[PDB]
Scaffold this active site. Structure first.
Site, PDB file in Angstrom:
ATOM      1  N   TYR A   1       7.772  -2.930   4.360  1.00 48.84           N
ATOM      2  CA  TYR A   1       7.497  -4.334   4.646  1.00 48.84           C
ATOM      3  C   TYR A   1       7.840  -4.610   6.101  1.00 48.84           C
ATOM      4  CZ  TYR A   1       6.958  -4.852  -0.326  1.00 48.84           C
ATOM      5  OH  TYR A   1       6.468  -4.649  -1.598  1.00 48.84           O
ATOM      6  N   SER A   2       6.928  -5.270   6.804  1.00 50.88           N
ATOM      7  CA  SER A   2       7.162  -5.613   8.200  1.00 50.88           C
ATOM      8  C   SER A   2       8.366  -6.547   8.247  1.00 50.88           C
ATOM      9  CB  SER A   2       5.955  -6.349   8.780  1.00 50.88           C
ATOM     10  OG  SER A   2       4.787  -5.555   8.732  1.00 50.88           O
TER      11      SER A   2
ATOM     12  N   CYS B   1      -2.630  -6.985  12.654  1.00 49.63           N
ATOM     13  CA  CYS B   1      -1.852  -6.716  11.453  1.00 49.63           C
ATOM     14  C   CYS B   1      -2.360  -7.499  10.247  1.00 49.63           C
ATOM     15  CB  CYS B   1      -0.377  -7.046  11.716  1.00 49.63           C
ATOM     16  SG  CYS B   1       0.770  -6.567  10.404  1.00 49.63           S
TER      17      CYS B   1
ATOM     18  N   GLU C   1      -1.431  -2.207  12.733  1.00 49.68           N
ATOM     19  CA  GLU C   1      -0.688  -1.943  11.508  1.00 49.68           C
ATOM     20  C   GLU C   1      -1.391  -2.680  10.376  1.00 49.68           C
ATOM     21  OE1 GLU C   1       3.759  -2.332  11.266  1.00 49.68           O
ATOM     22  OE2 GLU C   1       3.263  -3.694   9.610  1.00 49.68           O
TER      23      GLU C   1
ATOM     24  N   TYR D   1      -2.778  -2.511   6.167  1.00 51.51           N
ATOM     25  CA  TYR D   1      -2.430  -1.889   4.900  1.00 51.51           C
ATOM     26  C   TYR D   1      -3.169  -2.478   3.703  1.00 51.51           C
ATOM     27  CZ  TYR D   1       0.497  -6.007   5.654  1.00 51.51           C
ATOM     28  OH  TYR D   1       0.956  -7.272   5.954  1.00 51.51           O
TER      29      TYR D   1
HETATM   30  C1  LIG Z   1       3.590  -0.705   7.558  1.00 51.30           C
HETATM   31  C2  LIG Z   1       3.389  -1.620   6.361  1.00 51.30           C
HETATM   32  C3  LIG Z   1       3.823  -2.863   6.431  1.00 51.30           C
HETATM   33  C4  LIG Z   1       3.669  -3.757   5.363  1.00 51.30           C
HETATM   34  N1  LIG Z   1       4.110  -4.999   5.492  1.00 51.30           N
HETATM   35  C5  LIG Z   1       4.026  -5.861   4.501  1.00 51.30           C
HETATM   36  C6  LIG Z   1       4.522  -7.274   4.663  1.00 51.30           C
HETATM   37  O1  LIG Z   1       5.062  -7.721   5.673  1.00 51.30           O
HETATM   38  N2  LIG Z   1       4.370  -8.103   3.559  1.00 51.30           N
HETATM   39  C7  LIG Z   1       3.775  -7.705   2.375  1.00 51.30           C
HETATM   40  O2  LIG Z   1       3.646  -8.501   1.439  1.00 51.30           O
HETATM   41  N3  LIG Z   1       3.307  -6.417   2.300  1.00 51.30           N
HETATM   42  C8  LIG Z   1       3.418  -5.500   3.273  1.00 51.30           C
HETATM   43  N4  LIG Z   1       2.886  -4.256   3.125  1.00 51.30           N
HETATM   44  C9  LIG Z   1       2.362  -3.717   1.796  1.00 51.30           C
HETATM   45  C10 LIG Z   1       3.570  -3.362   0.941  1.00 51.30           C
HETATM   46  O3  LIG Z   1       4.170  -2.176   1.396  1.00 51.30           O
HETATM   47  C11 LIG Z   1       3.278  -2.958  -0.517  1.00 51.30           C
HETATM   48  O4  LIG Z   1       2.105  -2.081  -0.527  1.00 51.30           O
HETATM   49  C12 LIG Z   1       2.745  -4.176  -1.310  1.00 51.30           C
HETATM   50  O5  LIG Z   1       3.789  -5.145  -1.223  1.00 51.30           O
HETATM   51  C13 LIG Z   1       2.431  -3.912  -2.709  1.00 51.30           C
HETATM   52  O6  LIG Z   1       3.511  -3.121  -3.283  1.00 51.30           O
HETATM   53  P1  LIG Z   1       3.888  -3.320  -4.819  1.00 51.30           P
HETATM   54  O7  LIG Z   1       5.026  -2.487  -5.061  1.00 51.30           O
HETATM   55  O8  LIG Z   1       3.971  -4.765  -5.002  1.00 51.30           O
HETATM   56  O9  LIG Z   1       2.582  -2.739  -5.559  1.00 51.30           O
HETATM   57  P2  LIG Z   1       2.119  -1.245  -6.460  1.00 51.30           P
HETATM   58  O10 LIG Z   1       2.911  -1.676  -7.617  1.00 51.30           O
HETATM   59  O11 LIG Z   1       2.290   0.076  -5.823  1.00 51.30           O
HETATM   60  O12 LIG Z   1       0.676  -1.646  -6.553  1.00 51.30           O
HETATM   61  C14 LIG Z   1      -0.135  -1.166  -5.543  1.00 51.30           C
HETATM   62  C15 LIG Z   1      -1.100  -0.201  -6.111  1.00 51.30           C
HETATM   63  O13 LIG Z   1      -1.972  -0.825  -7.106  1.00 51.30           O
HETATM   64  C16 LIG Z   1      -3.373  -0.729  -6.694  1.00 51.30           C
HETATM   65  N5  LIG Z   1      -3.946  -2.054  -6.136  1.00 51.30           N
HETATM   66  C17 LIG Z   1      -3.474  -2.962  -5.193  1.00 51.30           C
HETATM   67  N6  LIG Z   1      -4.282  -3.986  -4.963  1.00 51.30           N
HETATM   68  C18 LIG Z   1      -5.399  -3.774  -5.802  1.00 51.30           C
HETATM   69  C19 LIG Z   1      -6.649  -4.530  -6.040  1.00 51.30           C
HETATM   70  N7  LIG Z   1      -7.048  -5.690  -5.447  1.00 51.30           N
HETATM   71  N8  LIG Z   1      -7.518  -4.019  -6.931  1.00 51.30           N
HETATM   72  C20 LIG Z   1      -7.188  -2.860  -7.547  1.00 51.30           C
HETATM   73  N9  LIG Z   1      -6.086  -2.072  -7.428  1.00 51.30           N
HETATM   74  C21 LIG Z   1      -5.207  -2.594  -6.515  1.00 51.30           C
HETATM   75  C22 LIG Z   1      -3.315   0.520  -5.731  1.00 51.30           C
HETATM   76  O14 LIG Z   1      -3.328   1.733  -6.527  1.00 51.30           O
HETATM   77  C23 LIG Z   1      -1.999   0.307  -4.953  1.00 51.30           C
HETATM   78  O15 LIG Z   1      -1.511   1.582  -4.537  1.00 51.30           O
HETATM   79  C24 LIG Z   1       3.039  -3.338   4.162  1.00 51.30           C
HETATM   80  C25 LIG Z   1       2.590  -2.001   4.107  1.00 51.30           C
HETATM   81  C26 LIG Z   1       2.764  -1.157   5.148  1.00 51.30           C
HETATM   82  C27 LIG Z   1       2.239   0.260   4.964  1.00 51.30           C
END
Ligand SMILES: Cc1cc2nc3c(=O)[nH]c(=O)nc-3n(C[C@H](O)[C@H](O)[C@H](O)COP(=O)(O)OP(=O)(O)OC[C@H]3O[C@@H](n4cnc5c(N)ncnc54)[C@H](O)[C@@H]3O)c2cc1C
Length: 295
Positions: A71-72, A253, A293, A295
């Site tokens: 998370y940023s 971003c 950046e 994602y």
């Molecule tokens: C460098 C970087 C910075 C980031 N900064 C932020 C930030 O500041 N704020 C923020 O909120 N997030 C940010 N993110 C994204 C964050 O890391 C997580 O990916 C995001 O919060 C979702 O994680 P989770 O654990 O909630 O979801 P998971 O439980 O892992 O669910 C995600 C998975 O479900 C699937 N999925 C997701 N969306 C969909 C869709 N529409 N349709 C179908 N399948 C889908 C994919 O398989 C994905 O891998 C950032 C990512 C990176 C790489």
């Protein structure tokens, strides 16, 4: 000099939640929370533009421990209270449906974070990243193209540049250049940090320009919904002219898929002067002045 991996997944820092506040106002789409964590008791230090990892509890569908999600960082190096004691995040609750499961599916880490209660202990890793760092040059120009939570690193830059308390805390960084934020969200209530962003523009009209792309409230010249790419096309020549300055840095971003339209707009602008944007851009990236950046 840049802090990196002070804490790793095998032995994360255990922080405590201080506050968890909503950023999406009534009438908005989805849930985006501003979460502040206490860093006392550890030595986690960081700078603007970096990210941290959060390890959510529980196991995945295969019974395997959940891994970290990045998370940023939403706060400047000093924290929202400018006391060097905290760190904040801007987290959107991820949700979708059918395509992956029964119906509405909720992201694991984002749901955990958006519903976390003050006092709770959280596993934090990092900081990480050297891709979105702000120049030390107080006269640099900074273009910020952000969509949704992509506003996060921009907040760290703008707060460091324009908050009274930050300017007082950073004698060596009294920003006097030009910053332009093009922020795209679906609705006005979805404008994250709206009040503070507009407060900054009112105080620094000559150093900060704020441009919105609100898809459910505005239409582009083609009749379609207004997106960041449309605003970039709208000001393509100006943006290109600013990008030509040797001290200008650009930051992009948010969710992936926003870069294509941005490049098409800038490409058309640069082409008028016999420049191939894709090539100029490669040099900018090499020079560390084109930061991305998504994602
Ligand atoms: C460098 C970087 C910075 C980031 N900064 C932020 C930030 O500041 N704020 C923020 O909120 N997030 C940010 N993110 C994204 C964050 O890391 C997580 O990916 C995001 O919060 C979702 O994680 P989770 O654990 O909630 O979801 P998971 O439980 O892992 O669910 C995600 C998975 O479900 C699937 N999925 C997701 N969306 C969909 C869709 N529409 N349709 C179908 N399948 C889908 C994919 O398989 C994905 O891998 C950032 C990512 C990176 C790489």
């Amino acid at each position: 000099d840049v802090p990196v991996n002070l804490y790793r997944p095998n032995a994360p820092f255990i922080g405590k939640v201080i506050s968890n506040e909503p950023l999406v106002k009534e009438g908005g789409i989805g849930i985006v929370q501003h979460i502040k964590f206490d860093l006392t008791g550890g030595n986690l230090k960081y700078i603007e533009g970096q990210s941290i990892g959060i390890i959510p509890p529980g196991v995945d569908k295969n019974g395997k421990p959940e891994k970290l999600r990045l998370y940023s960082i939403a706060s400047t190096r000093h924290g929202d209270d400018v006391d060097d004691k905290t760190i904040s995040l801007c987290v959107r609750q991820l949700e979708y449906k059918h395509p992956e499961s029964g119906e509405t599916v909720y992201g694991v880490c984002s749901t955990y974070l958006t519903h976390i209660e003050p006092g709770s202990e959280v596993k934090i890793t990092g900081p990480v990243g050297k891709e979105m760092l702000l120049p030390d040059d107080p006269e640099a120009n900074v273009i910020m193209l952000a969509g949704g939570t992509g506003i996060t690193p921009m907040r760290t830059y703008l707060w460091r540049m324009f908050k009274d308390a930050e300017r007082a805390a950073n004698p060596e960084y009294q920003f006097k250049g030009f910053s332009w934020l093009v922020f795209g969200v679906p609705t006005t209530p979805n404008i994250l940090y709206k009040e503070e962003l507009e407060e900054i523009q009112q105080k620094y009209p000559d150093n900060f320009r704020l441009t919105y792309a609100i898809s459910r409230e505005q239409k582009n010249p083609q009749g379609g919904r207004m997106y960041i790419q449309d605003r970039v096309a709208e000001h393509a020549d100006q943006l290109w002219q600013l990008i030509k300055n040797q001290k200008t840095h650009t930051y992009i971003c948010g969710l992936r898929g926003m870069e294509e339209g941005i490049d098409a707009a800038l490409s058309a602008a640069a082409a008028k002067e016999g420049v191939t944007w894709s090539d100029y851009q490669k040099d900018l990236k090499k020079a560390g002045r084109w930061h991305v950046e998504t994602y």
